[PDB]
Motif scaffolding. Structure first.
Motif, mmCIF file in Angstrom:
data_model
loop_
_atom_site.group_PDB
_atom_site.id
_atom_site.type_symbol
_atom_site.label_atom_id
_atom_site.label_comp_id
_atom_site.label_asym_id
_atom_site.label_seq_id
_atom_site.Cartn_x
_atom_site.Cartn_y
_atom_site.Cartn_z
ATOM 1 N N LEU A 262 40.386 32.679 37.719
ATOM 2 C CA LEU A 262 40.186 33.527 36.547
ATOM 3 C C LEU A 262 41.300 33.425 35.509
ATOM 4 O O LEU A 262 41.066 33.809 34.359
ATOM 5 N N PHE B 76 37.806 53.700 35.705
ATOM 6 C CA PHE B 76 37.167 52.580 36.385
ATOM 7 C C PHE B 76 38.102 52.057 37.464
ATOM 8 O O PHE B 76 39.320 52.002 37.270
ATOM 9 N N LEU B 77 37.532 51.681 38.607
ATOM 10 C CA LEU B 77 38.313 51.082 39.682
ATOM 11 C C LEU B 77 37.784 49.697 40.035
ATOM 12 O O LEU B 77 37.045 49.089 39.254
ATOM 13 N N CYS B 78 38.140 49.192 41.212
ATOM 14 C CA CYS B 78 37.684 47.870 41.624
ATOM 15 C C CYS B 78 36.169 47.874 41.803
ATOM 16 O O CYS B 78 35.614 48.769 42.451
ATOM 17 N N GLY B 79 35.498 46.879 41.214
ATOM 18 C CA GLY B 79 34.069 46.719 41.377
ATOM 19 C C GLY B 79 33.219 47.436 40.355
ATOM 20 O O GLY B 79 31.979 47.320 40.412
ATOM 21 N N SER B 80 33.841 48.188 39.443
ATOM 22 C CA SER B 80 33.148 48.887 38.369
ATOM 23 C C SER B 80 32.723 47.958 37.248
ATOM 24 O O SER B 80 32.054 48.410 36.317
ATOM 25 N N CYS B 81 33.112 46.687 37.309
ATOM 26 C CA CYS B 81 32.703 45.712 36.309
ATOM 27 C C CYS B 81 31.194 45.708 36.153
ATOM 28 O O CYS B 81 30.462 45.466 37.119
ATOM 29 N N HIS C 71 40.690 50.691 29.056
ATOM 30 C CA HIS C 71 39.671 49.704 29.398
ATOM 31 C C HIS C 71 38.942 49.173 28.169
ATOM 32 O O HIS C 71 38.930 49.792 27.097
ATOM 33 N N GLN D 130 41.818 36.482 33.164
ATOM 34 C CA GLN D 130 42.902 37.202 33.837
ATOM 35 C C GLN D 130 44.257 36.760 33.290
ATOM 36 O O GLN D 130 44.981 35.950 33.878
ATOM 37 N N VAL D 131 44.603 37.322 32.131
ATOM 38 C CA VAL D 131 45.957 37.253 31.600
ATOM 39 C C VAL D 131 46.316 38.605 30.999
ATOM 40 O O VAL D 131 45.452 39.371 30.558
ATOM 41 N N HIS E 248 31.342 47.254 30.865
ATOM 42 C CA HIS E 248 32.778 47.296 31.133
ATOM 43 C C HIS E 248 33.239 45.987 31.747
ATOM 44 O O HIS E 248 32.521 45.382 32.547
ATOM 45 N N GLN E 249 34.432 45.535 31.364
ATOM 46 C CA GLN E 249 34.865 44.213 31.819
ATOM 47 C C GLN E 249 36.295 44.141 32.361
ATOM 48 O O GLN E 249 36.577 43.292 33.213
ATOM 49 N N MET E 250 37.212 44.994 31.899
ATOM 50 C CA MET E 250 38.606 44.791 32.283
ATOM 51 C C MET E 250 39.454 46.021 31.981
ATOM 52 O O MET E 250 39.034 46.942 31.276
ATOM 53 N N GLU E 251 40.681 45.994 32.503
ATOM 54 C CA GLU E 251 41.639 47.086 32.378
ATOM 55 C C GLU E 251 42.951 46.494 31.902
ATOM 56 O O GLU E 251 43.440 45.539 32.508
HETATM 57 C C1 LIG Z 1 45.306 38.635 34.717
HETATM 58 O O1 LIG Z 1 46.411 39.445 34.568
HETATM 59 C C2 LIG Z 1 46.171 40.757 34.239
HETATM 60 C C3 LIG Z 1 47.269 41.424 33.815
HETATM 61 C C4 LIG Z 1 47.188 42.733 33.470
HETATM 62 C C5 LIG Z 1 46.010 43.393 33.545
HETATM 63 C C6 LIG Z 1 44.890 42.738 33.975
HETATM 64 N N1 LIG Z 1 43.680 43.189 34.121
HETATM 65 C C7 LIG Z 1 42.913 42.275 34.579
HETATM 66 C C8 LIG Z 1 41.451 42.505 34.778
HETATM 67 O O2 LIG Z 1 41.058 43.516 34.472
HETATM 68 N N2 LIG Z 1 40.564 41.509 35.196
HETATM 69 C C9 LIG Z 1 39.170 41.762 35.269
HETATM 70 C C10 LIG Z 1 38.528 40.412 35.423
HETATM 71 C C11 LIG Z 1 38.943 39.502 34.322
HETATM 72 C C12 LIG Z 1 38.499 38.160 34.692
HETATM 73 C C13 LIG Z 1 38.332 39.808 33.008
HETATM 74 C C14 LIG Z 1 38.712 42.694 36.339
HETATM 75 O O3 LIG Z 1 39.096 42.586 37.406
HETATM 76 N N3 LIG Z 1 37.744 43.688 35.995
HETATM 77 C C15 LIG Z 1 37.193 44.617 36.902
HETATM 78 C C16 LIG Z 1 37.375 45.940 36.233
HETATM 79 C C17 LIG Z 1 38.753 46.553 36.299
HETATM 80 C C18 LIG Z 1 39.327 46.623 37.789
HETATM 81 C C19 LIG Z 1 40.249 47.561 37.673
HETATM 82 N N4 LIG Z 1 39.607 48.592 36.740
HETATM 83 C C20 LIG Z 1 38.695 47.869 35.975
HETATM 84 O O4 LIG Z 1 38.003 48.331 35.162
HETATM 85 C C21 LIG Z 1 36.032 44.265 37.312
HETATM 86 O O5 LIG Z 1 34.973 45.417 37.364
HETATM 87 C C22 LIG Z 1 35.957 43.850 38.779
HETATM 88 O O6 LIG Z 1 36.517 44.542 39.570
HETATM 89 P P1 LIG Z 1 37.510 43.865 40.744
HETATM 90 O O7 LIG Z 1 38.080 42.506 40.578
HETATM 91 O O8 LIG Z 1 36.926 43.692 42.092
HETATM 92 O O9 LIG Z 1 38.756 44.679 40.832
HETATM 93 C C23 LIG Z 1 43.653 41.124 34.690
HETATM 94 C C24 LIG Z 1 44.949 41.435 34.319
#
Ligand SMILES: COc1cccc2[nH]c(C(=O)N[C@@H](CC(C)C)C(=O)N[C@@H](C[C@@H]3CCNC3=O)C(=O)COP(=O)(O)O)cc12
Lengths: 300, 299
Positions: free
Chosen positions: B47, B141-146, B173, B190-191, B164-167
């Motif tokens: 990512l 939002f937590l893990c898997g809320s994407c 968000h 993921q940056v 929703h896509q990222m935090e």
């Molecule tokens: C890469 O250096 C970083 C530095 C500082 C902050 C950063 N943040 C992220 C990020 O947010 N990355 C996205 C994926 C990228 C590819 C766009 C993500 O992860 N999104 C979640 C929603 C998030 C989960 C926590 N709360 C949410 O809303 C998905 O819904 C899946 O969930 P999970 O992977 O299973 O946690 C990368 C990053």
């Protein structure tokens, strides 16, 4: 990172109906073969100032009540039985609701939170979460025709129904029934004016909120000083504060921060004095609208 | 004045789990299309900077599995995958029987919308956000809320406006409109990303001050007036958004007889401090309540 969260309202929307008695109408909750709505539906506008519900009941009959399902699966709804239960009417209909969810009836203790579904004419319009104030009222948003809206929690698949709206008091402050019929705060479902007891800070929710502050780096208020629970519940009784009762959800917060309950009890004693122009998660007043359960699920 | 979302049962009927190799998140199932954030194709490792263009052609007939968990459960066979912006537009051989009348309107800063947070295709909670002047939201939002979805409702028409896509650094968000474009043009990669500095939603403060007057808290009104044009020039330097009035802000003006421009001046004063006063129980100005909010809830 802490927002007002409610359960997804669906399950409950599948249960909302309109209840009519003559020209008076409100909201009901259709669970299986039963329909619950506030009893003040029978009372004509004229007798609302001093109703005689024991009279109204016997004077009524199944043809007095018409139930209608305006949303989703439309419904032919016919009453075949009626009882009154405290401030609650318990109508019996001939079709069980097929969208009846797993449910129970628990009365909320003060400080706890629940979701409420704001309904008008048996049509849901909005959802929002409240907390049961220590004076047994709630600061919802409720308009004309919202009585019979419902308040619910949800552990697992079981919906714990806990509140049916009934009335408004001074400005903006509302109360209602537990589903055993009893009105919270022993308020009378009459159009008289009624005075509320004084509102106290729910101490446990303040503790949780301070814990959530620690979890987001805002810790400046954490000092080594500690006030006991026993001592705190004493100072509490004279500063508009609820007895602090610790729970295992609170212990969980206490471990991941390494900051003890008694450290934050003592700070509460200092911060009620005044923040002296400082902020904790953006506010100058203590927050008590978030439970330890809340902070756990949300900042997990 | 409570934070209020719409009912969610409609939107709950459309939520869906989408799974692509190791990756999994939520999608929205309307007609024969399932929408979802496109990073599900990227393996978790890669990512940091994916080649979503590569990843998409690498996909085959059975790359995506799709489950419905609430209501009538179902696996759905996908019959075509297209991409669009930061979203995957998936084609499924069954039209969603609970599809509502919907539109896809992008939301502008200051406006409120309802969110339905899901994990593994399952609704868990619902709240209301405002879109920040810097195109982030203050959500939970937590893990898997994407893939969770934000919506408004205009009559009985669901207006989908957010997936929703990222935090970013601490819990602010973002996600995309359903046209595909990330709000703020943050990258679905993921940056670490700089969020611009936020501002005050000038209109929502004018609404909130009108909410005070309605509840009898008028102490801050004075006959002085600042013109909108004057205000916006000032706003540039003082971390506010430019003021854009509305049929809805006008309703407040009428049922209060308080001019917009009086509260514009009143804003300029209160930005400094409340001088030991309180407004609807608060020390700083509050900008998360809309003119529509005040209109509905004090009506
Ligand atoms: C890469 O250096 C970083 C530095 C500082 C902050 C950063 N943040 C992220 C990020 O947010 N990355 C996205 C994926 C990228 C590819 C766009 C993500 O992860 N999104 C979640 C929603 C998030 C989960 C926590 N709360 C949410 O809303 C998905 O819904 C899946 O969930 P999970 O992977 O299973 O946690 C990368 C990053």
């Amino acid at each position: 990172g802490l927002v007002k969260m409610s359960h997804p309202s669906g399950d409950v929307e599948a249960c909302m109906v309109q209840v009519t008695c003559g020209s008076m109408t409100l909201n009901g909750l259709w669970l299986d073969n039963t329909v619950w709505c506030p009893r003040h539906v029978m009372c004509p506008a004229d007798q609302l100032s001093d109703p005689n519900y024991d009279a109204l009941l016997i004077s009524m009959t199944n043809h007095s009540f018409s139930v209608q399902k305006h949303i989703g699966a439309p419904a032919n709804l016919r009453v075949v039985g009626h009882a009154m239960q405290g401030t609650l009417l318990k109508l019996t209909v001939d079709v069980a609701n097929p969208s009846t969810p797993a449910y129970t009836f628990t009365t909320v203790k003060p400080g706890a939170a629940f979701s409420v579904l704001a309904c008008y004419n048996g049509r849901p319009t909005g959802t929002f979460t409240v907390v049961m104030r220590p004076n047994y009222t709630i600061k919802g948003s409720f308009l004309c025709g919202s009585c019979g809206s419902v308040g619910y929690t949800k552990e697992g698949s079981v919906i714990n129904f806990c509140y049916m709206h009934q009335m408004e008091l001074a400005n903006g402050t509302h109360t209602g029934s537990a589903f055993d019929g009893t009105m919270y705060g022993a308020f009378m479902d009459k159009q008289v004016h009624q005075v509320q007891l004084t509102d106290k800070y729910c101490s446990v929710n303040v503790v949780a909120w301070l814990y959530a502050a620690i979890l987001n780096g805002c810790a400046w208020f954490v000092k080594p000083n500690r006030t006991s629970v026993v001592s705190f519940n004493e100072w509490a009784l004279a500063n508009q504060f609820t007895e602090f009762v610790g729970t295992q959800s609170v212990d969980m917060l206490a471990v991941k921060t390494g900051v003890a309950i008694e450290q934050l009890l003592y700070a509460i004693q200092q911060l009620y004095t005044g923040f002296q122009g400082k902020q904790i998660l953006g506010s100058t007043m203590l927050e008590d609208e978030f439970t330890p359960e809340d902070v756990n699920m949300q900042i997990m």
